[PDB]
Design a protein around this nucleic acid. Structure first.
Length: 158
DNA sequence: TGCGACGGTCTGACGCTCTACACAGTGCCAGGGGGAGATAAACGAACGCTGAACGCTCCGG
């Protein structure tokens, strides 16, 4: 399931690459510890393989991923409650859900409501964070990375 | 009640000046009533314009 030299995406940090496999023991119990790091936060994440599905790691989605994200990115008839408090409580929960599709409609709704009205600048921080984590994710998912990954969105978001 | 002691309470604790200085860890947006501030009009008065008019010294045929 998990190998060395491949890339897997971690929640709240974007995609990352696996360095090697260690044999660290926690609470005196030996575990198959896997270590990986990201270049954004400059932090190393150590997660055992037994609870990898429990902690919520996902592998890189192949061709199936881009077509479904593009289709949802353009889905019309999207509605939200009039009160901003319910949407404010829902957006971070959907971000913490970790689904690529879910964060796709979240960022599409956020971008369209930011362009149509210009809400505020406080929400722009998490908007930019979501944009950064999605462009880091689609770096390996769509096989386009860095500036090329950012460029592809520039003409498909409208 | 008389006793001590235990306790809180309270006060200052000589004097200026050469010198002398400043001060920090936890939300957010929409709707709505005032008032300053730009716009064009408007009430009122006087400020110009029309040369005209009152009246003198005037060079004058």
């Amino acid at each position: 399931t998990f190998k060395v030299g491949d890339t897997v995406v971690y929640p709240h940090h974007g995609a990352a690459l696996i360095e090697a496999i260690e044999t660290r023991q926690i609470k005196g119990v030996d575990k198959t510890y896997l270590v990986l790091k990201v270049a954004q936060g400059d932090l190393t994440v150590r997660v055992p393989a037994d609870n990898a599905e429990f902690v919520g790691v996902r592998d890189v989605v192949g061709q199936d991923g881009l077509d479904r994200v593009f289709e949802v990115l353009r889905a019309p008839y999207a509605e939200e409650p009039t009160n901003w408090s319910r949407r404010y409580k829902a957006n971070l929960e959907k971000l913490a859900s970790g689904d690529v599709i879910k964060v796709a409609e979240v960022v599409r709704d956020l971008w369209r409501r930011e362009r149509e009205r210009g809400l505020s600048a406080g929400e722009k921080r998490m908007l930019a964070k979501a944009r950064q984590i999605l462009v880091s994710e689609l770096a390996l998912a769509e096989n386009t990375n860095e500036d090329k990954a950012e460029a592809l969105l520039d003409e498909v978001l409208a």
